[PDB]
Ligand SMILES: *[C@@H]1O[C@H](CO)[C@@H](O[C@@H]2O[C@H](CO)[C@@H](O)[C@H](O)[C@H]2NC(C)=O)[C@H](O)[C@H]1NC(C)=O
């Protein structure tokens with residue numbers, strides 16, 4: 411008792427099948443960027459889904475995520491690490 | 496010193512003293528680093544020099560760059576219902592006692608000590624001494640004559656000898672400079688040796704740089720030191736040399 | 743200049759005796775002796791089939807009360823100086839202030855790396871330490887960069903007063919003087935002779951050592 415006291419990713423099913431589950435999911439990214447270009451050239455349908463969740467800035471995505479208006483935000487890795495810390 | 500010669504632009508060369516250790520006015524004659532600067536065979540003495548009134552009359556000391564002192568180191572049915580309610584209350588009390596137990600589990604006077612002012616005057620004879628011919632020995636003789644007289648049979652000759660003798664139990668307390676004994680405490684094998692209290696300093700003073708009397712550099716010598724503290728180079732330098740391991 | 747240095751250089755004063763912060767500007771204009779104080783800078787903050795079921799349920803009750811004991815035990819048991827990022831880029835919430843036209847403001851202005859702090863303290867500089875202490879006692883302030891000994895005596899006086907951890911810029915307080923005068927050598931010798939013996943400890947017993 412004392413010891414006790416001491417004591418997936420981009421290819422997700424909810425991603426590859428967005429809004430295809432009992433709870434509709436939501437996620438998008440900023441258009442006209444390198445990340446948006448990569449998505450269109452590897453997952454056409456996944457790129458098409460995000461068209462209605464396009465953001466316009468880093469802060470807007472963070473606040474919308476905080477308000478619950480968005481569930482996931484995809485963006486550059488280097489800067490989103492900075493905002494997280 | 497490397498930082499010093501950079502901004503005032505003076506050349507120099509070093510050599511080691513052969514007679515004396517830090518300075519001792521014997522028959523009115525000073526030796527060591529201070530003794531030469533009196534004789535003007537050298538223009539500056541740099542090292543571990545303790546600022547005191549006696550040494551400030553033969554040379555001049557610039558502003559101290561590190562604070563030290565004198566310290567001592569030592570080795571570390573209704574009735575049935577009522578009965579049931581009583582049992583429940585006892586279990587509660589028992590729970591409070593246990594929880595509280597786990598929580599709690601998770602959770603010398605000084606130089607003027609009676610054993611010091613009355614050394615070897617108690618059932619267990621005590622022992623303590625220091626290195627002779629130093630500034631610390633001079634201070635003791637001029638404030639506690641009998642206490643100074645007692646330490647004559649416990650005189651050491653080096654930092655390591657005192658540490659080992661204390662480790663072997665041959666000595667009980669060692670009195671020496673505060674700045675260096677702090678260094679040895681954080682760099683000893685383990686943390687067996689500690690200083691009195693959480694760090695207690697008697698007769699606060701400073702370490703200084705000996706200069707030839709009435710030098711024209713003393714205005715420029717000290718002004719550089721004040722620039723060091725304002726910018727903050729001592730913090731990095733002291734972490735390089737004066738940091739320790741034990742806490 | 744103004745203040746103590748403004749009066750001393752005007753000739754109306756002769757010798758400044760006060761908790762004088764030794765810095766580089768003062769040493770050029772006026773003279774000092776050995777400092778009589780040793781401290782740095784910190785922050786002030788505020789704080790029969792049924793019988794088988796019966797024995798099984800008795801075991802259940804025992805394990806349930808053991809689990810409740812474990813969870814109640816878990817329930818009952820289980821800024822930091824200038825390096826606070828929330829103070830690196832402050833806001834209207836964390837209010838740190840200092841004394842207007844004091845040596846600390848000049849010291850922070852010297853290092854331009856704390857220009858934003860110099861741009862924040864400028865809006866809330868108070869005339870005296872008493873004003874800042876009263877305002878933070880009313881919880882109108884959140885931090886107060888100030889000397890260590892003064893804030894320690896204040897924390898002894900008021901139990902809600904709390905200091906931080908960092909101890910930086912280890913300077914001293916000394917006696918301001920006029921220019922080169924025979925009122926220097928013997929003054930510094932007297933200060934040293936006072937530091938050497940137990941006089942400083944007695945003065946601390948009078949005011950510094952005592953707690954409230
Ligand atoms: C991506 O680029 C397009 C084209 O520049 C942007 O669409 C423009 O949006 C502005 C503001 O609403 C309008 O005034 C223009 O008329 C639009 N032009 C076209 C052709 O659509 C779009 O907003 C940009 N998206 C981002 C933010 O990357």
Ligand SMILES: *[C@@H]1O[C@H](CO)[C@@H](O[C@@H]2O[C@H](CO)[C@@H](O)[C@H](O)[C@H]2NC(C)=O)[C@H](O)[C@H]1NC(C)=O
Nearest residue numbers: 515516519521625626627628629650651652653
């Ligand atoms: C203090 O100085 C005295 C005098 O130099 C030292 O006494 C000498 O000690 C050595 C080594 O034992 C002897 O060879 C000399 O003959 C001694 N001379 C005299 C006149 O006593 C003494 O050791 C020094 N103490 C320390 C270590 O500071």
